[PDB]
Symmetry: C3
Subunit: 301 residues, 3 copies
């Protein structure tokens, strides 16, 4: 039985078929999960995420249960294996948004129901799936390859993009400040994968180098939740995405941001609003992708 | 152009009355008119009574509600409202919002692909007034399409929305509040203008008993209006003569009904005796918000372009 | 019109038929409450409980409304009769998990809709029903009787096990520390009921005596919620009372251990023994679903 904790556990073919299914569903919605149930466990609230999941299962014919931070104190009252052995036995799927990946792993270990990583400090795979869906929608996938730049932290988003690029065969440039490092274990996995898929990966500390010859620019907040700051902002001096920065990329390149955005920091107001349409489709598109993911996990029991 | 429901000011006599009639049809013969449709409910300050009405309204109509709470959703505290609007408003069919500040509703509506519904703001509480109206009609206190109504209380949202609705509908309304208290001039002007068209007999005073003369419907509300709770002790003293009690109801017409949006504070704006004397109507009032939100949601579904 | 506030208000026959119905429903699920609604009022959150009820009504064809602690402040803003007379008139059932039983009573008194006691300081009947379901599933009900030991506090669980054993005709031994007493009013009810049903009830302060010739051992947390301002003292009082391997050894062969959860390994129960019984303890947990289903269908017919 398969969980969905990271795209690392999936094939190029599997990932692409999730995006194609999403697309079919967006076009022609079907109630493929009649009466199925999804428990949603949040350790830290995210309205954007919740919407995506709640609506995903709902539209597919099922029901969602929202168990919040207040509602559900994980590893703070009862142990996780206990919670897993009750909740994971009563519902068809469990999504979790967690502070720490270990928690997902520990839950999955004892969950009869497939567990979905709605966000952890290591990986944010649903988001990348949505980003991907969006790239395809905006016809920025020439030749099954995408030429992508990621600018920001060595955070979860970076990890997941690095990985996915590696699996899919994308050309990706990553840019973060000089003092910032990427996990050697993750990096190794990507190196291996690139060999098989022909990925052109590069990692640096120069925004403008990363941006050269790119059709898709991806950025993210610098001050990550919980990790709140004043010193960090000063470290990300050159790193804002602005008009001059987008100029360096290819003509008509799209800007993606997972949100929320902090105008005047990782992104300028002008440039952000310049790309409202794509940024907010991006936000919404997580729906179609979670749908696909849920149908998929339902068939891999 | 697509219509939101932020205040009754934006609607015609005919429109409001047809919402009530529809509510009534639905109460008689429930129908699932919004199959699969979705309603985001955003609360900035929790109201269980409201939530019930909306949740059940859409549910019974065949749809699904999403409750996003205060804890869940921090508006204008993290991300700007236009950003939220451009996500949430794009994914759901309707968005209801209970807000601290009306501007927030306006700003959201401005960016929402989905019709936004004012579940309560500091200026207006229209879904409540619709329910009050429904109730007045059910209790056969709308002789001649007109109603003879007294509103006693603060210059709060409820007052505004009664003033307005009276104005649109052509009702005869007397408002009573303390001497120092005023109604927003902008709102008052609208009402003056609307009365001309509709023949509303509107009067504002500071004498409970005058307001009450020849009335079939007495409406009151809490004095310490929500949020303004840092100022309560003072407000109470100002509302000395203003409680609705047996003697006060005596001044109104025979068999006049007492309406209160709830919750009620026995011993303040209303006496225990009198409140309980009207439990049947008051609690039907409570419940009747359901049918009215149903109508409203059907109505906004049909007015998308 | 009948509410479900304690098993005290039901007959042996009524209780057994709830368990039987549950069992039918587990076997063959049916949507017997199409479109019906359940308001769930929590004064203190319990995820385990919520799941049970939310899924019960949902699977039965209805809808749940979760009103939380933050959402709904009971007897702290508006009076309860007012709440009851709004909520209880818009939904088909009301479950409540409350700090104080009186609150259920007061609500029920003004609720058009049947109220269900999802847990109070006095009684936890839905849990006992589930326990019962589970005992029957693990074939530990020889001759319609069960031989049961309850070890723990004089809490809600104890009250409800005492009562139910009394109604049903079970043989039950209860063990708690010396200083601890059962509510005389509850105890007196049980005494009376045992006479009618032939219950073999005994109360002591000796874990091992309680355990002798038992097929079911039941335990529970010692630090009961709310009473957390007094904990350090309580733990010391419960020295001999943990359920461990040696304790289970005293009971009959293949005897099952039940715990309503959550559990505090190293206290009322040892890690080893708890995990030894994971399968039954977690079926126990899950089985609350089928029983709440039964209960809801039952209350739908007793209007």
């Amino acid at each position: 039985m398969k969980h969905f904790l990271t795209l690392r556990d999936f094939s190029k073919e599997e990932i692409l078929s999730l995006v194609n299914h999403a697309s079919e569903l967006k076009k022609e919605p079907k109630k493929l999960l009649q009466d199925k149930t999804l428990a949603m466990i949040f350790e830290k609230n995210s309205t954007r995420t919740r919407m995506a999941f709640e609506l995903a299962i709902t539209e597919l014919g099922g029901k969602a249960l929202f168990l919040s931070s207040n509602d559900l104190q994980l590893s703070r009252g009862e142990p996780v294996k206990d919670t897993a052995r009750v909740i994971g036995a009563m519902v068809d799927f469990v999504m979790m948004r967690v502070n720490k990946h270990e928690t997902l792993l520990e839950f999955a270990r004892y969950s009869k129901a497939p567990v979905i990583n709605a966000l952890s400090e290591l990986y944010h795979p649903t988001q990348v799936l949505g980003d991907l869906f969006t790239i395809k929608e905006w016809n920025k996938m020439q030749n099954g390859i995408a030429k992508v730049a990621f600018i920001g932290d060595s955070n979860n988003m970076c990890n997941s993009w690095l990985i996915t690029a590696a699996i899919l065969g994308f050309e990706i440039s990553i840019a973060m400040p000089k003092n910032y490092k990427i996990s050697p274990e993750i990096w190794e996995f990507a190196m291996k994968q690139a060999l098989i898929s022909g990925a052109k990966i590069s990692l640096g500390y120069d925004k403008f180098e990363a941006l050269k010859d790119k059709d898709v620019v991806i950025t993210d907040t610098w001050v990550s939740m919980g990790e709140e700051k004043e010193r960090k902002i000063k470290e990300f001096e050159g790193f804002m995405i602005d008009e001059k920065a987008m100029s360096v990329a290819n003509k008509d390149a799209i800007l993606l941001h997972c949100l929320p955005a902090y105008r005047g920091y990782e992104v300028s107001e002008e440039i952000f609003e310049k790309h409202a349409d794509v940024i907010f489709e991006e936000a919404r598109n997580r729906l179609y992708v979670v749908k696909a993911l849920l149908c998929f996990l339902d068939n891999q029991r």
